[PDB]
Amino acid sequence: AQELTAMSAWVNQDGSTLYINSINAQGELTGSYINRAAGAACQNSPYPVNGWVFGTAISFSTKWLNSVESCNSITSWSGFYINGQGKISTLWQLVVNGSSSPSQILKGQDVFSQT
Amino acid sequence: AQELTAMSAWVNQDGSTLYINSINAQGELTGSYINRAAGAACQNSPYPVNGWVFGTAISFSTKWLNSVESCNSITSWSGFYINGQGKISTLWQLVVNGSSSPSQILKGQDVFSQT
Numbered sequence: 262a263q264e265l266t267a268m269s270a271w272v273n274q275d276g277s278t279l280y281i282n283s284i285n286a287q288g289e290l291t292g293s294y295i296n297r298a299a300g301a302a303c304q305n306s307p308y309p310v311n312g313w314v315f316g317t318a319i320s321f322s323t324k325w326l327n328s329v330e331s332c333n334s335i336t337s338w339s340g341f342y343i344n345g346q347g348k349i350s351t352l353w354q355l356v357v358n359g360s361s362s363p364s365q366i367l368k369g370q371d372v373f374s375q376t
Numbered sequence: 377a378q379e380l381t382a383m384s385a386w387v388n389q390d391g392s393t394l395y396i397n398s399i400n401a402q403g404e405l406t407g408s409y410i411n412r413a414a415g416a417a418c419q420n421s422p423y424p425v426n427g428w429v430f431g432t433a434i435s436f437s438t439k440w441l442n443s444v445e446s447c448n449s450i451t452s453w454s455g456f457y458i459n460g461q462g463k464i465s466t467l468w469q470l471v472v473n474g475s476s477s478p479s480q481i482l483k484g485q486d487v488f489s490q491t
């Protein structure tokens with residue numbers, strides 16, 4: 262099973278990839294995200310990711326701005342690792358610049374499998 | 377009104393403080409969090425924070441490990457800035473190491489005011 266390690270790649274049910282680049286001694290995470298969810302904006306280019314790992318708990322977040330496309334928004338995922346196949350089961354929140362109410366924060370669920 | 381700037385402090389309804397230390401040119405955030413919610417664990421000591429800012433959108437997350445106390449968990453906040461008083465209205469998710477179901481991810485709402 263792939264575990265939560267530096268240079269690990271994870272794909273969700275919609276085909277999006279999280280790449281974890283580094284996890285430091287304190288568990289701080291860097292990486293990048295490529296969105297491929299059918300019909301979504303900001304697809305097919307890398308967006309920087311930061312976050313934390315604590316054992317099997319993981320959080321990661323991306324700002325949807327790069328040289329290719331801006332979605333004026335930020336997603337945060339909270340989740341946990343489960344295993345002979347590694348997966349990360351998450352809940353996510355997406356907040357958009359210019360929001361007026363927490364009711365406008367989109368929520369969903371993503372399950373990522375090792376690759 | 378205090379706005380989303382480096383070296384800004386924000387207090388929620390439960391008395392916890394977010395301190396934003398830096399926001400870089402790309403909007404990546406560093407800071408620290410001190411929890412003071414009545415009855416909570418990991419109170420009264422600083423926990424490192426990372427995250428993103430995009431205009432008025434903000435995400436930030438902390439791993440609850442420091443030299444004083446470990447809570448084996450990570451919180452992520454997603455929210456937005458509103459204003460003559462600055463506030464950040466957020467939804468948060470708390471995930472614990474060793475979780476087996478997304479139903480175990482605690483959710484809540486925090487509203488932070490400038491100080």
Ligand SMILES: O=C(O)CCCC[C@@H]1SC[C@@H]2NC(=O)N[C@@H]21
Nearest residue numbers: 277296298302303325332334336
């Ligand atoms: O629409 C936006 O504001 C930017 C793209 C958001 C894509 C989201 S993030 C949560 C979910 N998981 C994915 O892999 N894609 C969508």
Ligand SMILES: O=C(O)CCCC[C@@H]1SC[C@@H]2NC(=O)N[C@@H]21
Nearest residue numbers: 392411413417418440447449451
């Ligand atoms: O119990 C834990 O696992 C660690 C402390 C969690 C404190 C939470 S984070 C969400 C909410 N906002 C606060 O200021 N404190 C609680």
